[PDB]
Amino acid sequence: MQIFVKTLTGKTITLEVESSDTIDNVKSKIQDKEGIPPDQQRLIFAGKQLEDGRTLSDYNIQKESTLHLVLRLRGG
Amino acid sequence: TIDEGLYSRQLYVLGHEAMKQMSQSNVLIIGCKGLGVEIAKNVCLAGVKSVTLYDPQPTRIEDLSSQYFLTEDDIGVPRAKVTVSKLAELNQYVPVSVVDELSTEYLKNFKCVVVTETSLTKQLEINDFTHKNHIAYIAADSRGLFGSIFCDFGENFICTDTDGNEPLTGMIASITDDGVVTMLEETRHGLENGDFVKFTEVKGMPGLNDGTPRKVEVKGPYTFSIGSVKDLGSAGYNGVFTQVKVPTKISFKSLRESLKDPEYVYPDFGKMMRPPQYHIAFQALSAFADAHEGSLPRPRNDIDAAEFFEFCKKIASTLQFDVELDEKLIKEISYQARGDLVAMSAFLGGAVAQEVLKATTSKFYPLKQYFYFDSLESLPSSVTISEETCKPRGCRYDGQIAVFGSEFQEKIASLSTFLVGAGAIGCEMLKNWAMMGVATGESGHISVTDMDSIEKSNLNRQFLFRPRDVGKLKSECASTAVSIMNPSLTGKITSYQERVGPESEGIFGDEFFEKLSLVTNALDNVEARMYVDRRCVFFEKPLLESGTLGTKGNTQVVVPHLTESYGSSQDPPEKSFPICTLKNFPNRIEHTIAWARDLFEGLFKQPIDNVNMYLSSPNFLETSLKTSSNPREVLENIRDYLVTEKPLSFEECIMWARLQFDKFFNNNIQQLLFNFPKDSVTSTGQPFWSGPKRAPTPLSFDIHNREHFDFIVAAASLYAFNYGLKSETDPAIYERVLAGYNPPPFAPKSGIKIQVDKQELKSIADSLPPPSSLVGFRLTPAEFEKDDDSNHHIDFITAASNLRAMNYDITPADRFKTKFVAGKIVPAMCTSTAVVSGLVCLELVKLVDGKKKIEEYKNGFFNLAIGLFTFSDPIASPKMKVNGKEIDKIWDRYNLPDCTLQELIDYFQKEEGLEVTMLSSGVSLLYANFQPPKKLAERLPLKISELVEQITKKKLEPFRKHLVLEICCDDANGEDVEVPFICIKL
Ligand SMILES: Nc1ncnc2c1ncn2[C@@H]1O[C@H](COP(=O)(O)OP(=O)(O)OP(=O)(O)O)[C@@H](O)[C@H]1O
Ligand SMILES: [Ca+2]
Numbered sequence A: 001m002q003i004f005v006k007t008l009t010g011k012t013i014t015l016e017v018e019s020s021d022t023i024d025n026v027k028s029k030i031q032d033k034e035g036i037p038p039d040q041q042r043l044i045f046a047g048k049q050l051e052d053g054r055t056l057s058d059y060n061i062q063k064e065s066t067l068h069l070v071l072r073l074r075g076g
Numbered sequence B: 001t002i003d004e005g006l007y008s009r010q011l012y013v014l015g016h017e018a019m020k021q022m023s024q025s026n027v028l029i030i031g032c033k034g035l036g037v038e039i040a041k042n043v044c045l046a047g048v049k050s051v052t053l054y055d056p057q058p059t060r061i062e063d064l065s066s067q068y069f070l071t072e073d074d075i076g077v078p079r080a081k082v083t084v085s086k087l088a089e090l091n092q093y094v095p096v097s098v099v100d101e102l103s104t105e106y107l108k109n110f111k112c113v114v115v116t117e118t119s120l121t122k123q124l125e126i127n128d129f130t131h132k133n134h135i136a137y138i139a140a141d142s143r144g145l146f147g148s149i150f151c152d153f154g155e156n157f158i159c160t161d162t163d164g165n166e167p168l169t170g171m172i173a174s175i176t177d178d179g180v181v182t183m184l185e186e187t188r189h190g191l192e193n194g195d196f197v198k199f200t201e202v203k204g205m206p207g208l209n210d211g212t213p214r215k216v217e218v219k220g221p222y223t224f225s226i227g228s229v230k231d232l233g234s235a236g237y238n239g240v241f242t243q244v245k246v247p248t249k250i251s252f253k254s255l256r257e258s259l260k261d262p263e264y265v266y267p268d269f270g271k272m273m274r275p276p277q278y279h280i281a282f283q284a285l286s287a288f289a290d291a292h293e294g295s296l297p298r299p300r301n302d303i304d305a306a307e308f309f310e311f312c313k314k315i316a317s318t319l320q321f322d323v324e325l326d327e328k329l330i331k332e333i334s335y336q337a338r339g340d341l342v343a344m345s346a347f348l349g350g351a352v353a354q355e356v357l358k359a360t361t362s363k364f365y366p367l368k369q370y371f372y373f374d375s376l377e378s379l380p381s382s383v384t385i386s387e388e389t390c391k392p393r394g395c396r397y398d399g400q401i402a403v404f405g406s407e408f409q410e411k412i413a414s415l416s417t418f419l420v421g422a423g424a425i426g427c428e429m430l431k432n433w434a435m436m437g438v439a440t441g442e443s444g445h446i447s448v449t450d451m452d453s454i455e456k457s458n459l460n461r462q463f464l465f466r467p468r469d470v471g472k473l474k475s476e477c478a479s480t481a482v483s484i485m486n487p488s489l490t491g492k493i494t495s496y497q498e499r500v501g502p503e504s505e506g507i508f509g510d511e512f513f514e515k516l517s518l519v520t521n522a523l524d525n526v527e528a529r530m531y532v533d534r535r536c537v538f539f540e541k542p543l544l545e546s547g548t549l550g551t552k553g554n555t556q557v558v559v560p561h562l563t564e565s566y567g568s569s570q571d572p573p574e575k576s577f578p579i580c581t582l583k584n585f586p587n588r589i590e591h592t593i594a595w596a597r598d599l600f601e602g603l604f605k606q607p608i609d610n611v612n613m614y615l616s617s618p619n620f621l622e623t624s625l626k627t628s629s630n631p632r633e634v635l636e637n638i639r640d641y642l643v644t645e646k647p648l649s650f651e652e653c654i655m656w657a658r659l660q661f662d663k664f665f666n667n668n669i670q671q672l673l674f675n676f677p678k679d680s681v682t683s684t685g686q687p688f689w690s691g692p693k694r695a696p697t698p699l700s701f702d703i704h705n706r707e708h709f710d711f712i713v714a715a716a717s718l719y720a721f722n723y724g725l726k727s728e729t730d731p732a733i734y735e736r737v738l739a740g741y742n743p744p745p746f747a748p749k750s751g752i753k754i755q756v757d758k759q760e761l762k763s764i765a766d767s768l769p770p771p772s773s774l775v776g777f778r779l780t781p782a783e784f785e786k787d788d789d790s791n792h793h794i795d796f797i798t799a800a801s802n803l804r805a806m807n808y809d810i811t812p813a814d815r816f817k818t819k820f821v822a823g824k825i826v827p828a829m830c831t832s833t834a835v836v837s838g839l840v841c842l843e844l845v846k847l848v849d850g851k852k853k854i855e856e857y858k859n860g861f862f863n864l865a866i867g868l869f870t871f872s873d874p875i876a877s878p879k880m881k882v883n884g885k886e887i888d889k890i891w892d893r894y895n896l897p898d899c900t901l902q903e904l905i906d907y908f909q910k911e912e913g914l915e916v917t918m919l920s921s922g923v924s925l926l927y928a929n930f931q932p933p934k935k936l937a938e939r940l941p942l943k944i945s946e947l948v949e950q951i952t953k954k955k956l957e958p959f960r961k962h963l964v965l966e967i968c969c970d971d972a973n974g975e976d977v978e979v980p981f982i983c984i985k986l
């Protein structure tokens, strides 16, 4: 299938993944496009943050689904 | 034109041109309750032309649940007139007036109109006019844990910046005639299809460097297409591109026609199916109002709910909204209908406020067009929520009790918080806590700490402070300021000036923590957050975290024995340029600026310190060669700053300044070009100065050149400041000593280290006078200070940066940008700070409710610039199995008294089923079953504390209350296993 990952900076990234793909495997495809180490990646789907070890299907992420790639801020 | 001493921060997120539109925009705000006041507060601090209020209604006691500008005795008086007096006190540059009449024509005076606490019927009447005359219309409402914002900026509104981001930029390596632009060495361009870019400095295709934008077709992360361009050349080489932000028109529907086909902006893709329901409910809330004379459903009332529910079905069909009404959900809005939470007002306030700025600047993508939010998870479940418990009480907390109940209100009152930080977020936090009545009870108590003082620029995001407060402590001033908003806090707040960290552990010790209910961060640096986090985890206390960056902001809740801590996840470090890029091969203005800043520190700070240190520490000289990295630099800094070059007149300083010029903008350059010829080549036969390396060019002095002059003036003045000499400003004075200057010839030496003595150095230290000869003498080191102009600090750096800029043919930058980068300023404003504070408190109530289910907490992430909001459940602390029992790798620990080694060992084996094989404290090994029967026999009988002091050979400190230990042991199977730490409570 194909999913979309919109980031806090308004950027949209298109990925070619399978429902059985692992989150670790997704983070990497993202690292190849944006260059963000999987460790710093915060992917959220339908109010749930994705965790390594599980898979896209474990989050019911289906075709054409949209995820968010957010980050923590240092400013206060 | 624009006050950069105040709007400094906010200008980095909005921009000048953007604020000039604001200063010429009049805003109107209907309603002056929690929401309305919050909106105003921000709009005022924002810098619009003026603010106009309108709210005839009295001042019910319940209004004080979120209206921090209404006191106990203002009851009766029109909220409009009562608050206008304080909002005017916020931003001087912004006048605040009131109006008693609501004229349709009168509206054409304001660029934007905010509508709060108004019936739908009245709303239409207002939008119909506003929309037709092209007048920004915004409507919002806070109903308990529910909220809603609507926007209408005309059917032809134009946006000139849709994301707020800085126009991308990047160096090129090549570009085919087909339009195949290839980025530099592994450099990412970060462009999206449909983006436009212009070019500059591209050889092989001159007509390309004209400026005309070109649509981009991303072919990969390192390459993109712009279409065939063979009619401009055959192949371009190394250049630089720049993204062109193309505006776009956004067509808004009238509240009337949009009410039919509403366009939702989902703030949470997890509650995807709720906005529609809310669209109905909120209108039903309006209908019900008219029926009962503008009054809303009674708190947790069932009869009103039933009726309310009917109105839903009423408009559900008339609007022909084909949806399955969710009775339970919708009825919830009826119960909480009278709810007036301050957190909800802070959230929707900063949010709406930002929208107003958008409508008056055409900057950032607006909410189009329905924003229905809810934090239903906040609703308490550890107390009884009934029509009875949520009944009014005649106190300022009715608006809150209406949602959580009187029973719950007690818990909030008896809280013992600890706010770390008193800046932007700090103020908003206190404000919210005041309205919520935190620490108002008996055992309640707030503790605010911060080691910084108030500054002009701070008065833009930190409202609890005033200009006349500048120079005063934040924690202390904010504390007092809060006692006025809710007197019930007087004597309930303790302020501190201690910097939270390892040192302050004296004040914030075990006893201090064991009392706290929870901790909230309002910090500005990652290091501090980390420290607090660690402590909270050790003391098993909850922590509320939040951050901001311009329009972006984030929230994170860390609850004990449930979620992971703040430091459990990782964040990207600070981007620091390569030492050899700033030193010799800069290509971006940011490079020269960082360089300029080291130059500053290297000529007016580092050297001075060595002078004073030499006149204070006895064995300073000796201990230097033993530690100091560049003992040479040290010895020289003294020799030159004490005698070799000690000035005696500003005129003698101008000579020094002039010398520096050639030393860092001429000779240094020459020396480089000597080691690396302006056309020399590499081993691959490629031009050494190609791509990432711009060929420099020594600069000859010129008494009549802004940069050249600005540098001399700054440099000289600063050198003076060091020795204490009257700095001059009259230009003629410089010429009179510079025009008659003769610089010693410079010839680049052979054999110099450029990255891509035992007697000399020690002999020079003998040419220096003994500290004895200059007893009591000291120099004045220059402490960098971005926020000022009477110090020549930024003036220096700008010039120094723009001078090195000329060296490497790099485009210069005004002191506005230079200040931003040189001082590493964090762009930010009031809007974001408010949004986070709200979200933060919306979670705070979840902690006092004692919610144990993780799916109920939420971490926030948002970017006002694009109207993006997203939340996610917190990550669970990593668990682990030891002897079948599940343990928390983050929170569980073994609590034991100061027992004997033998005892502790027996304990683990008899009570935990663990055979302790190794015990340690820090880097010291206290015990190990594989040690000789001697070492053991002599220690086993000792008490832990005793054993520690012995092995450490350093007796414990009497200010300690705890003592952490690590252990290694085997489970019941004899197999090594990992267990929690041990906390000896001695
Ligand atoms: N380790 C710490 N312990 C306690 N307070 C801290 C610590 N580090 C930072 N702070 C304080 O946190 C507060 C909130 O930060 P904020 O960014 O709002 O303020 P600021 O640094 O004064 O603003 P600016 O950076 O624009 O000058 C500040 O007053 C700051 O001094
Ligand atoms: Ca982009």
Ligand SMILES: [Ca+2]
Residues within 6 Å of the ligand: B644, B645, B646, B647
């Ligand atoms: Ca001299």
Ligand SMILES: [Ca+2]
Residues within 6 Å of the ligand: B886, B887, B888, B892
């Ligand atoms: Ca446990």
Ligand SMILES: [Ca+2]
Residues within 6 Å of the ligand: B882, B883, B885, B912, B913
């Ligand atoms: Ca155990």
Ligand SMILES: [Mg+2]
Residues within 6 Å of the ligand: B452, B455
């Ligand atoms: Mg400061």
Ligand SMILES: [Mg+2]
Residues within 6 Å of the ligand: A076, B524, B826
């Ligand atoms: Mg700061």
